[PDB]
Amino acid sequence: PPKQAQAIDSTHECHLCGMLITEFPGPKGELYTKTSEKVKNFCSTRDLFSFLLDPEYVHQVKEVYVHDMSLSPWAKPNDSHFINARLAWFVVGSSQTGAMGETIGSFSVKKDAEAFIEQYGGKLYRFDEITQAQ
């Protein structure tokens, strides 16, 4: 039984960097580790990937969720539309920023990610192709 994404409220702080999450724009992230039933919330897809690619945690991470920017506006992502990050399309290197500056756009629809790149630049990636280089 997969653990489910949860709403992010105004008091939630990023698991990596401690900043308040919902003040800032850009897709946010959540994930669970095998060891804890409490979801870990992140201020940005940037910090989500930084955490889950860290060798200390890479094997502990099970469920990973990101806002679907096919459905939610960039400035105010909506917690009703979390998608499975492992099946999403990602845009790295666009001009659009999140809570930590540069960030990773996340979409359910490949053509939406491609149109995003047409507008704002960047490159298209699947979950597995995102490494510590990016």
Decide if residue 20 touches Cu ion (CB under 5 A): no
Strands annotated E in the chain: 29-33, 40-42, 61-67, 82-84, 89-98, 101-107, 123-126
Say whether 112 counts as a known binding-site residue. Answer: no
Q: Is 54 annotated as a binding residue?
A: no
With CB under 5 A as the contact rule, the residue among 17, 53, 61, 71 that binds Zn ion is 17
Closest distance to Zn ion from the beta carbon of 83 (Å): 20
How many residues make contact with Zn ion (CB under 5 A)?
5
Sign of the CA dihedral 12, 40, 7, 119? Answer: positive
The residue among 14 and 88 lying less far from Zn ion, judged by its C-beta, is 14
Q: How close are the terminal C-alpha atoms of the chain, in Å?
A: 32
- Count the site residues for Cu ion by CB under 5 A: 4
Handedness of CA 99, 129, 54, 83 (dihedral sign): positive
* Stretch of residues binding Cu ion (CB under 5 A), selected from 33-41, 80-88, 97-105, 124-132: 97-105
